[PDB]
């Protein structure tokens, strides 16, 4: 919706009701995102850094426009911020369309990236630890893939599956189930049949997964953001 | 529940202009991707044109780049398109389009404006 | 891509599939539209995002994108799905909106 930024948070929303975009604004920069005919600027720095998750549809990605800007001033990137959402968790992407030009700074030239900026919600604490999940796995232009990931704790063992995405397909493999700073339940794996993967966990009951995959081919590496809950 | 409405049927010498104008009758026009697209008898949909708000301008086809301007203004809760240069090639029904993204689908559109031109 | 590629015209018995075609050099790369049309009246979207399927739409209607072909795909044809159907995309190359020509679905019958 244009809500998540211009309405507060009413608690009686859908599921994981607000998250912060500090991730995707540059070092001293803007983030300007729009989108159903309102506007909102998210300056760096700032408390004022959240997005009103609660607002938009759950298990779909919610899209919007924006534009990267720095410090006179300079304009870095734009193109389509793309979040999926689901009751704990949320994974957000960034479909740079075009850039800043390397030469004519003050021009924008063409080219497209994808690049996971985000990965928040209610993260399950490793030691609270007590299932499979499907889910739902898109790159630039490529949001209908699917993901299926199962482990079980007690194994504390990783491996799950990518598929249906018009692209290739990739493998998630022998990842052991971790803890990282945040003393967060963290799986962390490699990946083919071709680079690497990182899968968070979230929920009260670790209910859902959110992360982001890496796919070498050739010299391009295309990320992957992937999500998914239990059921 | 939102429903554009457009200006009303045209009739144009060639070498004239046209002002198509847009509003929405559940909702607003105004800070939303409206979009251009144009049908000509016998033939499907091409595109115009449309207003980018985050870069605040407007986006143009080829063809009509240097001839078309695509505004909104809103004093009058109004987007308009503007095509001058006239030409019998411009008969056409023109629709405009809402869309809540810059490439995002058009999910809403006008009941078309059909502008004849003719000498 | 940037050029889509529709027939002109596909014909189809009532309740089998019919299979309509948009073609794009590596459209999988493009996340395409699809927009119904009937005689005079404005366009309605019925797919987006490739398999995406919008408020009104019947479940008969669904889309896919992959290698050089998009497909939607309406299954048990009713008589009133006679319509003509556009393939949309944005094609960044260019900063362009492109439709297909269309596709006029003729129910046989």
């Known amino acids: 919706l244009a809500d998540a930024l211009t309405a507060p948070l009413d608690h009686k929303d859908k599921g994981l009701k607000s998250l912060t975009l500090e991730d995707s604004i540059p070092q001293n920069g803007t983030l300007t995102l729009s989108a159903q005919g309102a506007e909102k600027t998210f300056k760096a720095g700032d408390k004022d850094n959240s997005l009103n998750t609660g607002k938009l549809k759950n298990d779909k990605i919610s899209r919007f426009d924006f534009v990267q800007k720095i410090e006179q001033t300079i304009t870095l990137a734009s193109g389509e911020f793309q979040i999926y959402k689901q009751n704990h968790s949320a994974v957000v992407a960034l479909q740079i369309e075009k850039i800043n030009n390397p030469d004519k700074t003050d021009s924008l030239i063409n080219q497209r990236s994808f690049l996971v900026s985000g990965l928040g919600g209610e993260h399950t604490a490793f030691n609270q630890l007590p299932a499979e999940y499907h889910g739902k796995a898109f790159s630039s232009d490529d949001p209908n893939g699917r993901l299926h990931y199962s482990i079980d704790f007690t194994k504390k063992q990783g491996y799950g599956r990518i598929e249906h995405l018009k692209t290739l397909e990739v493998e998630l493999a022998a990842a052991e189930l971790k803890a990282d700073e945040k003393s967060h339940a963290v799986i962390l794996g490699d990946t083919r049949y071709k680079g690497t993967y990182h899968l968070a966990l979230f929920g009260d009951r670790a209910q859902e997964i959110a992360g982001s995959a890496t796919v070498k081919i050739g010299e391009k590496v295309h990320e992957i953001g992937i999500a998914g809950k239990q059921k | 529940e939102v429903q554009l409405v457009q200006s009303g049927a045209e009739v144009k010498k060639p070498g004239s202009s046209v002002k198509v104008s847009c509003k929405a009758s559940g909702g607003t026009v105004i800070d939303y991707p409206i979009t251009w697209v144009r049908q000509a008898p016998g033939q499907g949909l091409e595109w115009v044109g449309g207003?980018?708000?985050?870069?605040?301008?407007?986006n143009y086809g080829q063809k009509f780049q240097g001839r078309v301007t695509i505004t909104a203004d809103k004093s009058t809760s109004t987007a308009s398109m503007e095509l001058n240069s006239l030409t019998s090639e411009d008969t056409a029904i023109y629709y405009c389009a809402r869309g809540d993204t810059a490439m995002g689908p058009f999910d809403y559109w006008g009941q078309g404006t059909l502008v004849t031109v003719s000498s | 891509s940037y050029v889509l590629t529709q027939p002109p015209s596909l014909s189809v018995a009532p309740g089998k599939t019919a299979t309509l075609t948009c073609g794009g050099n590596?459209?999988?790369?493009?996340?395409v539209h699809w927009y119904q049309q009937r005689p005079g009246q404005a366009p309605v979207l019925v797919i987006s995002?490739?398999?995406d399927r919008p408020s009104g739409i019947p479940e008969r209607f669904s889309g896919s994108n992959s290698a050089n072909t998009a497909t939607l795909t309406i299954s048990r044809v009713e008589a009133g799905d006679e319509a003509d159907y556009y393939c949309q995309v944005w094609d960044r190359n260019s900063d362009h909106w492109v439709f297909g020509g269309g596709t006029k679905l003729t129910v046989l019958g």
């Open positions: 590596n459209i999988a790369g493009k996340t």
């Open positions: 207003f980018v708000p985050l870069f605040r301008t407007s």
């Open positions: 995002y490739d398999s």
